[PDB]
């Protein structure tokens, strides 16, 4: 029940290869069928589930990743790919393998792995 | 085969895009063999036939600027027919006229949603890239059988159950747009200036028809020409646009095979009001062929009708 930092104020700023990551995010954001989960921060009171945040200490969502990509918070691409991978990994812990959400995430993770192999 | 409680007019109105749009009823028809300069849409790659309706949605700043100039001047833009989609090479095409326009500022980003109907066929003569990178094309307008319509209408009735136009040129285009054929045959029919030759070739093309499978793995037969039915006034194949801006040409069939349904039914952005969509994908390649539509009221006789994207199919 707390939003992750979308933009900082004291960090340095660099602009290299993060433009390519914006094209990757554009392919997943808009694929778009299963993007509406993991779009915005997971909402525990509306879902009724009062155990999600206790199971997953770190909250990562596509929109948070987008806001950090615009304020140039990331100085290295690795931190982004780690954050995207963390979003998928968290889903696989709370949800069982037969759940549809686990099937949705797999398709996105396949697209993400394909596009992140054309790094410049 | 079943009765229809659905209103064929509601899908044509395109309520999903909006409802309070400005309407232009003026019509402009250039003279045959005249030469004209027409700007082209940068993202469209479909092959439009005269009388077909194109729903559009544009986000990019260079694109809204062209639409605003078009409304002030003659409201006409060109949609080309490319032999290779990746390439920008084209030879023929059809003009499109905006009859509906709406501007919207969503979160500070200017949004235009327009609806246009194709008017006249043309031949590309030259295409230069504008200073803003939005190519303008110099083209030349191209000039343009009761027993024949009978045989076509007879066979068409065998495929599915006065909806068809009565005029010759109007009937030829209807068949060409709604036939389950390859886009190579669409270009060939467009190149045919006369209506008589076009109707005779449509009869030959429809008699020999093949089933459709998925384009990615080409291993699962999806549907046949006998399962086709028309849920809209335009016909079985009509064009609809998704919220992000990509236009889909959807084929409405009554039954399909080899497709698994993922998720729960939802009504958000439903191209057919009154119905809910569930994503369907191939059991081999998992290519997300189309969406299956489930009704929300028990009074609608077509409770379930499939909706397939033409882009993911290839005739066998
Ligand atoms: C993350 C996480 N991790 N675990 C969980 N979640 C979750 C998080 C959030 C939510 C949630 C619930 N509600 N909302 C509330 C958030 C809801 C956001 C809005 C969702 C609907 N809009 C997006 C999809 C649509 C769209 C988009 C792109 C293209 C096209 C279309 C439609 N479309 C076509 C389709 C065909 C057609 O006819 N027309 C079209 O336009 C397209 O071309 C547009 C409408 C969000 C649930 C979950 C779930 C979950 C998810 C799904 C399901 Cl079945 C079951 C459970 N499970 C958990 C708790 C364990
Ligand atoms: Zn397949």
Q: Tell me the three-class secondary structure of chain B, residue by residue.
A: CCCCCCCCHHHHHCCCCCCCCEECCCCCCCCCCCEEEEEECCCCCCCCCCCCEEEEEECCHHHHHHHHHHHHCCCEEEEEEECCCCCCCEEEEEEEEEEEEEEEEECCEEEEEEEEEEEEEEEEEEEECCCCCCCEEEEEECCCCHHHHHHHHHHHHHHCCCCCCCCHHHHHHHHHHHCCCCHHHHHHHHHCCCHHHHHHHHHHHHHCCCCEEECCCCCCEEECHHHECCCCCCCCEEEEECCCCCEEEEEEECCCCCEEEEEEEECCCCCCCCEEEEEEEECCCCCCCEEEEEECCCCCCCCEEEEEEHHHEEEC
Quote the number of domains for chain A. 1
Which residues of B are known binding-site members for Zn(2+)?
214, 217, 282, 285
Atom in ligand 1 nearest the alpha carbon of residue A49: 59
d(CA A21, CA A6): 16
- The domain made up of B146-209 has a fold known as Methane Monooxygenase Hydroxylase; Chain G, domain 1 (1.20.58)
Inside any domain, residue A5: no
Q: Where are the domains of chain B?
A: 31-141, 146-209, 213-315
How many residues in total does chain B contain? 316
Name every chain B residue with its beta carbon within 8 A of the beta carbon of A32: 242, 244
Interface of B with A in 205-264 (CB under 8 A): 242, 244, 262-264
Inside any domain, residue A101: yes
**Contact in structure between B308 and B223 (CB atoms under 8 Å):** yes
Domain holding A65: CATH number?
1.20.920.10
Report chain B's C-alpha Rg in angstroms. Answer: 20
**Contact in structure between B290 and B307 (CB atoms under 8 Å):** yes
- State whether CATH 2.170.150.20 applies to domain B213-315: yes
**Contact in structure between A4 and A62 (CB atoms under 8 Å):** no
CA distances from B169 to A43, B53, B141 (A): 56, 16, 16
d(CA A28, CA B209): 37
Name every chain A residue with its beta carbon within 8 A of the beta carbon of B263: 100, 104
Beta bridge partners of B309: B250
Inside any domain, residue A8: no
d(CA B269, CA B273): 9
HSE-up of residue B192 (Cα within 13 Å, Cβ side): 19
Inside any domain, residue A80: yes
Distance from CA of A26 to the nearest CA of B (A): 11
Which-ligand-closest: CA of B313? 2
Q: How many CB atoms lie within 10 A of CB B88?
A: 13
d(CA B308, CA B224): 12
Residue A67 phi, psi dihedral angles, 5° rounding = -65, -40
**Contact in structure between B152 and B199 (CB atoms under 8 Å):** yes
Technique used: X-ray
Inside any domain, residue A1: no
Nominal resolution (angstroms): 2.9
Inside any domain, residue A7: no
Q: What angle do CA B64, B249, B222 make, to 5 degrees?
A: 150
Architecture of the B31-141 domain: Roll (2.30)
What is the residue range of A76's domain? Answer: 13-120
Of B139, B109, B133, nearest in space to B38 by CA: B139
**Contact in structure between A87 and A106 (CB atoms under 8 Å):** no
Beta bridge partners of B23: B100
Which-ligand-closest: CA of B314? 2
String of DSSP letters for A20-47? HHHHHHHHHH---SS-STTSS---HHHH
**Contact in structure between B242 and B248 (CB atoms under 8 Å):** yes
């Amino acid at each position: 029940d707390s939003q992750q930092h979308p933009a900082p104020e004291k960090s340095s700023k660099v602009s290299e290869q993060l433009k390519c990551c914006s094209g990757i995010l554009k392919e997943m954001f808009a694929h778009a069928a299963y993007a509406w989960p993991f779009y915005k921060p997971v909402d525990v009171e509306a879902l009724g589930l009062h155990d999600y945040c206790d199971i997953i200490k770190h909250p990562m969502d596509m929109s948070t990743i987008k806001s950090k990509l615009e304020a140039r918070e990331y100085r290295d691409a690795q931190e982004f790919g780690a954050d995207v991978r963390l979003m998928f990994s968290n889903c696989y812990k709370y949800n069982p393998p037969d759940h549809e959400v686990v099937a949705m995430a797999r398709k996105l993770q396949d697209v993400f792995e394909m596009r992140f192999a054309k790094m410049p | 085969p079943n009765i229809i409680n659905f209103d064929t007019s509601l899908p044509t109105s395109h309520t999903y895009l909006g409802a309070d749009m400005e309407e232009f009823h003026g019509r402009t028809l250039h003279d045959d063999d005249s030469i004209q300069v027409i700007p082209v849409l940068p993202q469209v790659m479909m092959i439009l036939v005269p009388g077909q309706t194109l729903p559009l949605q544009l986000f990019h700043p260079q694109e809204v600027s062209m639409v605003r100039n078009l409304i002030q001047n003659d409201r006409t833009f060109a949609v080309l027919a490319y032999s290779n989609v990746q390439e920008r090479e084209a030879e023929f095409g059809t003009t499109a006229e905006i009859y509906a326009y709406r501007e919207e500022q969503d979160f500070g980003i200017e949004i235009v949603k327009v609806k246009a109907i194709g008017r006249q066929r043309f031949k590309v003569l030259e295409l230069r890239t504008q200073s803003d990178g939005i190519q303008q094309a110099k083209v030349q307008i191209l000039p343009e059988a009761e027993t024949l319509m009978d045989r076509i209408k007879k066979q068409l009735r065998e495929w599915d159950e006065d909806s068809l136009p009565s005029n010759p040129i109007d009937f030829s285009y209807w068949v060409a747009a709604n036939l389950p054929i390859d886009d190579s045959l669409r270009i060939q029919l467009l190149k045919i200036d006369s209506a008589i030759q076009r109707l005779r070739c449509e009869l030959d093309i429809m008699n020999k028809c093949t089933s459709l499978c998925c384009k990615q793995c080409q291993e699962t037969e999806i549907t046949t020409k006998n399962e086709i039915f028309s849920l809209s006034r335009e016909g079985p194949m009509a064009a609809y646009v998704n919220p992000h801006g990509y236009v889909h040409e959807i084929l409405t069939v009554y039954k399909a095979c080899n497709l698994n349904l993922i998720g729960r039914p939802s009504t958000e952005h439903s191209w057919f009001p009154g119905y809910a969509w569930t994503v369907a994908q191939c059991k081999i390649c998992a290519s997300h062929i189309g969406w299956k539509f489930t009704a929300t009221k028990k009074d609608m006789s077509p409770q379930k009708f499939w909706g397939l994207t033409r882009s993911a199919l290839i005739p066998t």
